[PDB]
Design a protein around this motif. Sequence first.
Motif, short mmCIF file in Angstrom:
data_model
loop_
_atom_site.label_atom_id
_atom_site.label_comp_id
_atom_site.label_asym_id
_atom_site.label_seq_id
_atom_site.Cartn_x
_atom_site.Cartn_y
_atom_site.Cartn_z
N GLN A 69 0.82 -1.21 0.00
CA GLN A 69 0.00 0.00 0.00
C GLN A 69 0.86 1.26 0.00
OE1 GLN A 69 -2.19 -0.49 3.69
NE2 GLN A 69 -3.53 -2.06 2.80
N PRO A 70 0.85 2.03 -1.11
CA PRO A 70 0.08 1.77 -2.34
C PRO A 70 0.77 0.82 -3.32
CG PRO A 70 1.20 3.82 -2.56
CD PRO A 70 1.38 3.40 -1.11
N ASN A 71 2.08 0.63 -3.15
CA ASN A 71 2.85 -0.26 -4.03
C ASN A 71 3.61 -1.30 -3.22
OD1 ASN A 71 2.37 1.30 -6.58
ND2 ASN A 71 3.53 2.87 -5.48
N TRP A 72 4.00 -2.39 -3.88
CA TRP A 72 4.75 -3.45 -3.22
C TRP A 72 6.24 -3.19 -3.27
CZ3 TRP A 72 2.28 -7.24 -0.57
CH2 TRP A 72 0.95 -7.55 -0.92
N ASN A 73 6.95 -3.72 -2.28
CA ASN A 73 8.40 -3.62 -2.23
C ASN A 73 8.86 -4.77 -3.13
OD1 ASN A 73 11.13 -3.85 -1.65
ND2 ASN A 73 10.87 -3.55 0.56
N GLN A 74 9.30 -4.44 -4.34
CA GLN A 74 9.72 -5.47 -5.29
C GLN A 74 11.13 -6.01 -5.07
OE1 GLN A 74 7.76 -7.01 -7.01
NE2 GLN A 74 6.00 -5.71 -7.50
N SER A 75 12.05 -5.17 -4.60
CA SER A 75 13.42 -5.60 -4.36
C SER A 75 13.52 -6.37 -3.05
CB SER A 75 14.36 -4.40 -4.32
OG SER A 75 14.10 -3.58 -3.19
N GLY A 76 12.65 -6.02 -2.10
CA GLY A 76 12.68 -6.67 -0.80
C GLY A 76 13.74 -6.06 0.11
N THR A 77 14.32 -4.95 -0.31
CA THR A 77 15.37 -4.29 0.47
C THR A 77 14.85 -3.28 1.49
OG1 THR A 77 15.69 -2.54 -1.19
CG2 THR A 77 17.00 -4.54 -1.43
N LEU A 78 15.69 -2.98 2.49
CA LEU A 78 15.33 -2.02 3.52
C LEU A 78 15.10 -0.67 2.86
CD1 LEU A 78 15.23 -1.18 6.57
CD2 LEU A 78 17.66 -0.63 6.35
N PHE A 79 16.02 -0.29 1.98
CA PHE A 79 15.95 0.97 1.26
C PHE A 79 14.62 1.17 0.55
CE2 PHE A 79 16.96 3.89 -2.29
CZ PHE A 79 17.56 4.92 -1.57
N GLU A 80 14.19 0.18 -0.24
CA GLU A 80 12.92 0.31 -0.94
C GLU A 80 11.75 0.32 0.05
OE1 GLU A 80 10.11 -1.71 -4.42
OE2 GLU A 80 12.22 -2.29 -4.28
N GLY A 81 11.91 -0.38 1.17
CA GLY A 81 10.85 -0.41 2.17
C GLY A 81 10.56 0.99 2.68
N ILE A 82 11.62 1.77 2.89
CA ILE A 82 11.47 3.13 3.37
C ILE A 82 10.70 3.95 2.34
CG2 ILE A 82 12.67 5.23 4.07
CD1 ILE A 82 15.03 3.48 4.91
N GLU A 83 11.05 3.77 1.07
CA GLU A 83 10.39 4.50 0.00
C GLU A 83 8.92 4.13 -0.11
OE1 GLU A 83 14.24 5.16 -3.02
OE2 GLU A 83 12.45 4.07 -3.70
N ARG A 84 8.62 2.83 -0.03
CA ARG A 84 7.24 2.37 -0.12
C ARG A 84 6.40 2.87 1.04
NH1 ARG A 84 9.33 1.52 -3.87
NH2 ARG A 84 8.84 0.28 -5.73
N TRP A 85 6.99 2.95 2.23
CA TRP A 85 6.27 3.43 3.40
C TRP A 85 5.97 4.91 3.23
CZ3 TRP A 85 3.63 1.96 7.56
CH2 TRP A 85 3.40 2.91 8.57
N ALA A 86 6.94 5.65 2.71
CA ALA A 86 6.78 7.08 2.50
C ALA A 86 5.64 7.39 1.53
CB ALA A 86 8.08 7.69 1.98
N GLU A 87 5.36 6.46 0.62
CA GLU A 87 4.30 6.65 -0.37
C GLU A 87 2.90 6.48 0.23
OE1 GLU A 87 5.38 3.59 -3.26
OE2 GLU A 87 6.36 5.14 -4.48
N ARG A 88 2.84 5.96 1.45
CA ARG A 88 1.57 5.73 2.13
C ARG A 88 1.28 6.80 3.18
NH1 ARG A 88 -1.14 3.27 6.07
NH2 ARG A 88 -2.81 1.78 5.58
N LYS A 89 2.13 7.82 3.23
CA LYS A 89 2.00 8.92 4.19
C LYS A 89 0.57 9.45 4.36
CE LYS A 89 4.66 11.22 6.12
NZ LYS A 89 5.13 11.19 7.53
#
Lengths: 423, 423
Positions: A69-89
């Motif tokens: 939500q709204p997008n999936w973490n495709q790489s599965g990395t910590l870095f992308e997780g932070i970005e994906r979380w930020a998109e749900r602000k």
Amino acid sequence: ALQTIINARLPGEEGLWQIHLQDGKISAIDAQSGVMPITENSLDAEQGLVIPPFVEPHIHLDTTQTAGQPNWNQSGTLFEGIERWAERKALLTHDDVKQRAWQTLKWQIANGIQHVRTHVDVSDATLTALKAMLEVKQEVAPWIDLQIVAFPQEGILSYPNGEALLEEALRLGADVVGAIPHFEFTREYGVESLHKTFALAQKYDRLIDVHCDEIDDEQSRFVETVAALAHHEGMGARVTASHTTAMHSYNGAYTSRLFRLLKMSGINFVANPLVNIHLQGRFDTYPKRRGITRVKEMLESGINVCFGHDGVFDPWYPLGTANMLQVLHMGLHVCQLMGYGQINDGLNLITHHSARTLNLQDYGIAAGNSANLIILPAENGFDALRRQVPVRYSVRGGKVIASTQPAQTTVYLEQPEAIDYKR
Amino acid sequence: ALQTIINARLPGEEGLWQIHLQDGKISAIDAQSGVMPITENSLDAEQGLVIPPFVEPHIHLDTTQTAGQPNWNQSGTLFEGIERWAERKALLTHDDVKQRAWQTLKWQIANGIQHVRTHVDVSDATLTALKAMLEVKQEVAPWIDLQIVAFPQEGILSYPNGEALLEEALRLGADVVGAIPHFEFTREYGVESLHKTFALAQKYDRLIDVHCDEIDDEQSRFVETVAALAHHEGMGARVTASHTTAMHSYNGAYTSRLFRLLKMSGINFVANPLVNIHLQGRFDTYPKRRGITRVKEMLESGINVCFGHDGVFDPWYPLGTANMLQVLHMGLHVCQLMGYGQINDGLNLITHHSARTLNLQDYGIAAGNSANLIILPAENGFDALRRQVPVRYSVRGGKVIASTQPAQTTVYLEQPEAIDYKR
Ligand SMILES: [Fe+3]
Ligand SMILES: [Fe+3]
Ligand SMILES: [Mg+2]
Ligand SMILES: [Mg+2]
């Protein structure tokens, strides 16, 4: 109301046992010389294992259920997780936090978990998730005793007003003071942050649970300060060092010296197998380290260590059903605690040891304690772990709060045959 | 008899699908624009996932179900496992092997596994387990297509009459020629054993599956000989390198050079996550390597790799219920294939990739193929993996051979609530 639990097996004990209940408490525990007949007001454990409730010593209910939500973490990395979380602000609101926390809490109730310690990010001037979690704590109280850790995710000294916000969280009711020294800008800020953490814990009489050395850095040794300060203040029982994954990379000589202090300090340790195996070793190519703290050695040394799930269905850990036997299964494999006895005694890592970590005062199948217990349809810890059995019944205050009717498997050979995965 | 499978989801496809059956085969596959009504002769997948059967590409049915007989492996080490197995010698008979193999095979049938490749120790002049397994193969045929690997556990050149016994096993009907080069006395015997293995495979027209480089030795590179010989003979599809755990410890430059050959050779690779994480890294102190082969890189390079359970309830691996989703779960974590798509595509590692490894000619949901398929009560691979769902129905030859009525969990809050662990 339930008056007795019959035909119960108990870890470390031979035979069957009867647990008498009265006024929501355990009145007595008597051995049986054979199988007892069922009857009104009796809950039949059917020679299954009876243990105090499973415990979740480390989870983040403020981030749970947001994977994809709204997008999936495709790489599965910590870095992308932070970005994906930020998109749900935009979706992070009071009601949103309560809804998601409750969803995972329901899974935990279904899984026989009656004690949960959730960390809550307090590196937020609005303290939105904290205010929501404090309400959730009150709402879920009849089923789960929830502890809230004021977790300064962005650091205490490395984030604007970090210390003031940490203290504000305690003034609002957080049960535990958190910290994250390895994330502070400098080693000095890391050490100083721990002095501030301990000062706050003593000022408000709260527990401590530090996200400690969660990094594959052989030089990250904040754990020695956590243990030393605990020893100095004579408060080991109230202190916990979560993760300590850096310990997986320490040289053996330093670790041996350190262990003397760890034992003397009496502090608790939490390892989070599912997340640690996933997030650690990410900077290695091959070979790749496991990255879990020294669980086996801690057990051999009598140092209290236990297992947490950490994340459930979120950007950093996409999986999970909040199942402690699953967490245990991963930990036994990665920590190579695969001897029969090591596996069988594994339940301690998700029951008694975790209760100690949460400094619980009413826990265990003993006369005088509240009638909080769960029934597993298995012969012992080894069997429960091997077959990943569900919780047949969860009892709290002498009342059933959850039950699972086991799956029924049949194979159609020359004749139909029921399969229970037992030999 | 069943004529149709309706409301089926298929990996990589959108929407729902209908699978028409006729004469034990799939006659056609048509997309649905909505949910179809159930009816007589129709099996409703209920929007669950339909996939070809799970496959077990690597298991030892000759040693399965013996853990704790007569004593348990308390250390959990390979060394003690050998000792514990030796203590059960008196019980190793024809009937004993058949009984235990059948017990695990029943668990596999219950778990939707219709294809199994079992290794059988042929470093035994009496070939007791092999003779027993050949009968089991015939007996279980209606439910599972069992392949038998003649596995020279003690070596081909390093054991008395090793080569003669290996060939005798093939003359008796073993489907696959095995080897174990890293266990031979010398590197030269290791390489020579592979030439002998390939010569036998070509002489009898059999497949090859080598226990290859299962050791944390950066110098164990027998895999390059396996791949080179396969390429030379133009038989890559018929060749498999099991384990290759040494690859986890190779330097990157050699691995890069090697990968060109691996791809060109077309050979198959089997990783055994549950056992590898347990038995590898045992000579390390800290940090400790994971020890699984380069699964992620193989997938990225288009090299066929899949997962096996290896051992089930025996002296070397005390756990297991022969569940492939459990094997997959461990592999995704240890190999860090934790991105959403990587997890979702994980099913390939226990279905299609394993079918290729076994050189199966009748596998997959496609018109013309036998009606062998299973139904998982999940939306996709990610969901099936996260919730560790059972196999709702297993269909073989258009007939149901196994079914599991899912567990039913209820939590008693202000009102009873069903919990399915979905958000
Ligand atoms: Fe955490
Ligand atoms: Fe094997
Ligand atoms: Mg974390
Ligand atoms: Mg083996």
